[PDB]
From Swiss-Prot:
Ribosomal protein S6 is the major substrate of protein kinases in eukaryote ribosomes. The phosphorylation is stimulated by growth factors, tumor promoting agents, and mitogens. It is dephosphorylated at growth arrest. Component of the 40S small ribosomal subunit. Plays an important role in controlling cell growth and proliferation through the selective translation of particular classes of mRNA. Part of the small subunit (SSU) processome, first precursor of the small eukaryotic ribosomal subunit. It comes from Homo sapiens. The gene is RPS6. The modification Phosphoserine is found at S33. Component of the small ribosomal subunit. Part of the small subunit (SSU) processome, composed of more than 70 proteins and the RNA chaperone small nucleolar RNA (snoRNA) U3. Belongs to the eukaryotic ribosomal protein eS6 family. The chain holds residues 116 to 173 of 249 of the full protein. The lineage of its organism: Eukaryota, Metazoa, Chordata, Craniata, Vertebrata. The modification (3R)-3-hydroxyarginine is found at R22. This is Small ribosomal subunit protein eS6. Changing R22X: Abolishes hydroxylation by KDM8. It comes from the Eukaryota.
Amino acid sequence: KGEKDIPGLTDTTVPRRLGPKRASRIRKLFNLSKEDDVRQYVVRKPLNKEGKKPRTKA
RNA sequence: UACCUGGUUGAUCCUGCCAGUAGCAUAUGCUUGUCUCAAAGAUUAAGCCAUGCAUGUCUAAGUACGCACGGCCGGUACAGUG
């Protein structure tokens, strides 16, 4: 990147969906030791659609 | 059912072939009411091919973060069907 902002590209940011799934890749992104529960730090997709209940998928 | 019969001469006896006769298989003609099985683009061109179909596959048990549905309970790693 230079110094300006191109309006079609740079100013937005994407939610990079689908976090890590293998239990070693969780600890590489969150820096857990052995005694930390990996399932404490799992990413949950904030799922939402009209006409339906708010659901959360992991 | 281990079979013969007409044809050479004025007449005869033979050699001998032609012709008939009976199946069986391919075609074909004329005809064809019922009923049971049944072959069927081999022969000529292993010639040429429109179109469509003829090879796919998930259990409890390889991989599910598709809400595509719905379901507890909403900090519940993953309910489930898929």
